[PDB]
Design a protein around this ligand. Structure first.
Ligand SMILES: Nc1nc(N)c2ncn([C@@H]3O[C@H](COP(=O)(O)CP(=O)(O)O)[C@@H](O)[C@H]3O)c2n1
Ligand SMILES: Nc1nc(N)c2ncn([C@@H]3O[C@H](COP(=O)(O)CP(=O)(O)O)[C@@H](O)[C@H]3O)c2n1
Ligand SMILES: [Zn+2]
Ligand SMILES: [Zn+2]
Ligand SMILES: [Zn+2]
Ligand SMILES: [Zn+2]
Lengths: 517, 517
């Protein structure tokens, strides 16, 4: 009777300009995808056709490319406003530059509500931040109203830098009272829009009474009903139907990441706000959808300040630097090896390296005459961390390599890329006993060679400060390390190594392997 | 009744200054060995004690260090004359700089006979070279005379550059008539002094009638009776006794190489020149034997011209660069990998490398604050060849890798050191079927990885010109190659790569492996 068209995106990660098929920098414009200008054309095409439409963003617009390194969120605000988003949920990467880095660039400049019900501000901050983000928003859609209630990952204090003032409550505990409040105001059509991952989105649908639809992000999930249009493999059907505890069929959606797909769900409601049915599929923002001229011309104006990073050629590559999550979080990926070889070459003392696959966040292409610029490296290592030195026991590395594949097969970034280590896993074995072989490049030896790792011996390892501090559940490294020394800036390490090598050709050479039985 | 003390050396290879235990450049003088000054002290110590003494050299004084690169044989002559050698046999490395490079520096300036019965000069050369080298020499030792008859490897035309004018006959065919001639002149005490290897030395003793003793070289053989004094493992007892076809016990000797040992054999003869018995052992020229002051002061005068190569620091190494024959001809050695990584880095197109272990002729030490100079690299790659590019079929590389271990276990230089290749051998299998696995770094692929070698596919390989031309029995490469392009000078390739890397740490990382069963 009353149809609503929800449009949505998540984990856009500063991909304001059209990208390549792999979400890295665009070279061949004839086959490029995504970008805010192309997203605007589909959005308007839909707005003309459908009278009741909501554009919503389910978190992580911050951090990803040189755009955010330079504009620090002012670009997210300006272009999201230009596209006319109806609402947005806070994701963990909105806190990467502290609470000040979220407040000044985005919250003050955004012309649309920013939502998160489970973030409670306490102490001195509570007074300034009040009203700049809300737990919900009752938005008028035509003759009707739709309630939108936000949620952010409760893991944000560990994953980002939100500070001691913000308290991140359980998603389901904080959402139910805001939903019950919306229902008491006869707001019967209600959407849960947040950033906690597909598993938490599925629990929110199941447990939170009243929630009619769940838009979400954080897990880069791709759902699709039928034959998909690109290389992304669907995790389930679009929408993913969750039968609630109160027998209600609740649809759950996600639109992959990098602004490559525009999520699209048509929900058909009745008079009492019940969902009769729904259907849709994420729309591939490919070359067939033209970029809007007004937006593309405005992107080109903002691009001028970023071209000082695009000018300097750091080196050259005669191979595809596979810095994708589908390789780096599952197998040995040549980007992981390159970064580990630059890490080891930087300090040289130390021969071993361990790098989390989730820290490698973009590939680099070889087809632009193989050139590598600061802009390419700014997408691979956008966090600006440091490659620190740590002294570790053999049992601590064994425990780390066991953590590296404890929940293998979920696209989790804890999978380790290595240098100076030869590891062999057996996924048939139980979690905590999957490392069958682990040889390491000896230090106390005249001719280095790969000998078995000994539990009672001490080894020096160069790794990101994220891992040294316990990130990605690597609590054993933080607790059991014997020494920790702060290293150089991650981009400056790989940038120096590339200029030293001039031409690079990293390969997948058997540092990580998997056994049959 | 009449005792003769034969003293001898072989494969000295321009080690005029004292060396390290591994025969590379001397750093810690307190534990150094060999050198012409130290060799002179033992030689004179013996000459005082024994009245009937012969110092003889069984070939390969040419090529090995910066001394020969600069002085081109003038140093061999001057210092061999200073030590007062009684005779010398021509080895294949005496022909490395052509016949002119043997004539002018050495043959004309030597004050002792130079011998080789199996080299016959023909055409225009025969007239100039006549008399500058002899097939034999009847030397007066006290009241007696000893005949010395020479022999050079019949493989010299392939191993060196003696030119089309010199003909190299079979050792045994050319020696018998010169021995029979010496016997007709009642020369009953006769020594075979040559350069063909321990196997040919053993056949010369067995087959050539009349030869009482066989001094030799070419195989770097170490013989020793009892507990040896250093890291060299004896191939047999000193002397190695050969029972001849005519029931005569013939002793066979060799004194390792690099002037590290002074070979010493006491032969007790009767009145008719028959060998009653013999005994001895190679003397380790270690720190306990002092270097003669007069000679050391004369070495220091000649060293002044060589110090322009010792000044420039090319790079630095934090690992022992194992460029020894005991590793590089038997297993994967880190010097082989370094050279193959410099070869691949030079041309970069091409990802694979094959380098013969015999072409790596000296290690480099890490204890001199890790510094690497042109003098260090001049000992590893003294031949000044070129690393050429070749297009090869998969079956041609399979045949090459099968040749690499066809006669494994004889310290032959045909063993291949590789880059961009992962090879696994099974020495239990028969010669020609010992390669069980052979993966290669793919070229026609976006992300290089190690995939099985395919017989019908074509691969590009960077290898020394020695191997491209069929050297070390690699006839299949010369015959079956599809393309061959001349590359850069070998020293200039590794010298450039070291300066690019600054600090290097090559390792033994599983490019070559051996299976159990
Ligand atoms: N090196 C390093 N430094 C950090 N500060 C950092 N923060 C997050 N990551 C990685 O990001 C991965 C998750 O990425 P994702 O699944 O695409 C979700 P989200 O990060 O976009 O919210 C984690 O598993 C970490 O490996 C870090 N990696
Ligand atoms: N690269 C390259 N270029 C060449 N021109 C050359 N000539 C000889 N060799 C190597 O030297 C090895 C033999 O060395 P050896 O046993 O110590 C006897 P000898 O060479 O001193 O007479 C061979 O097996 C070859 O690999 C070459 N290697
Ligand atoms: Zn994200
Ligand atoms: Zn996230
Ligand atoms: Zn030799
Ligand atoms: Zn020789």
């Amino acid at each position: 009777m009353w149809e609503l068209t929800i449009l949505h995106t998540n984990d856009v990660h500063s991909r304001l300009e059209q990208t390549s098929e792999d979400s890295s920098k665009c070279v061949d414009a004839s086959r490029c995808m995504g970008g805010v200008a192309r997203l605007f054309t589909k959005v308007q095409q839909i707005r003309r056709a459908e009278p009741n439409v909501l554009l919503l963003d389910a978190g992580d617009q911050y951090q990803g490319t040189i755009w955010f390194t330079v504009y620090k969120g002012a670009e997210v605000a300006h272009f999201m406003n230009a596209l006319r988003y109806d609402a947005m949920a806070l994701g963990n990467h909105e806190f990467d530059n502290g609470v000040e880095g979220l407040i000044e660039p985005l919250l003050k400049e955004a012309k649309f509500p920013i939502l998160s019900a489970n973030i409670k501000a306490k102490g001195p901050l509570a007074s300034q931040i009040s009203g700049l983000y809300l737990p919900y928003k009752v938005l008028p859609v035509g003759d009707e109203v739709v309630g939108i209630v936000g949620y952010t990952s409760k893991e944000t204090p560990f994953l980002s830098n939100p500070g001691t003032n913000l308290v991140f409550e359980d998603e389901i505990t904080a959402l139910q009272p805001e939903v019950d409040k919306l229902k008491t105001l006869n707001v019967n059509k209600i959407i849960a829009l947040g950033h906690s991952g597909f598993e938490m989105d599925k629990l929110i649908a199941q447990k939170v009474r009243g929630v009619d639809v769940v838009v979400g992000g954080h897990s880069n999930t791709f759902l699709y009903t039928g034959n998909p249009p690109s290389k992304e493999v669907p995790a389930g059907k679009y929408p993913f139907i969750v039968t609630s505890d109160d027998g209600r069929k609740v649809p759950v959606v996600q639109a992959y990441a990098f602004g490559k797909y525009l999520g699209y769900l048509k929900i058909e409601f009745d008079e009492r706000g019940n969902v009769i049915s729904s259907h849709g599929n994420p729309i591939l923002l490919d070359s067939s959808i033209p970029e809007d001229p007004s937006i593309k011309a405005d992107i080109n104006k903002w691009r001028i300040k970023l071209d000082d990073y695009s000018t300097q050629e750091l080196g050259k590559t005669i191979v595809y630097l596979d810095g994708s999550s589908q390789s780096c979080r599952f197998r040995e990926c040549n980007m992981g090896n390159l970064i580990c070889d630059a890490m080891i070459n930087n300090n040289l003392h130390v021969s071993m390296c361990i790098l989390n696959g989730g820290g490698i966040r973009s590939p680099i292409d070889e087809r632009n005459d193989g050139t590598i610029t600061w802009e390419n490296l700014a997408a691979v290592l956008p966090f600006g961390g440091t490659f620190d030195l740590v002294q570790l026991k053999g049992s601590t590395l064994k425990k780390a390599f066991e953590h590296s594949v404890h929940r293998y097969g979920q696209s989790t970034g804890e999978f380790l890329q290595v240098g100076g280590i030869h590891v062999v896993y057996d996924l048939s074995r139980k979690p905590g006993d999957r490392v069958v072989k682990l040889d390491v490049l000896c230090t106390k030896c005249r001719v280095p060679s790969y000998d078995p790792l000994k539990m009672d011996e001490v080894y020096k390892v160069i790794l990101p400060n994220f891992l040294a501090n316990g990130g990605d559940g690597f609590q054993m490294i933080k607790d059991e390390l014997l020494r920790h020394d702060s290293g150089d800036q991650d981009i400056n390490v790989v940038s120096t190594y590339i200029s030293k090598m001039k031409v690079i050709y990293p390969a997948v050479e058997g540092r990580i392997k998997f056994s049959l039985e």
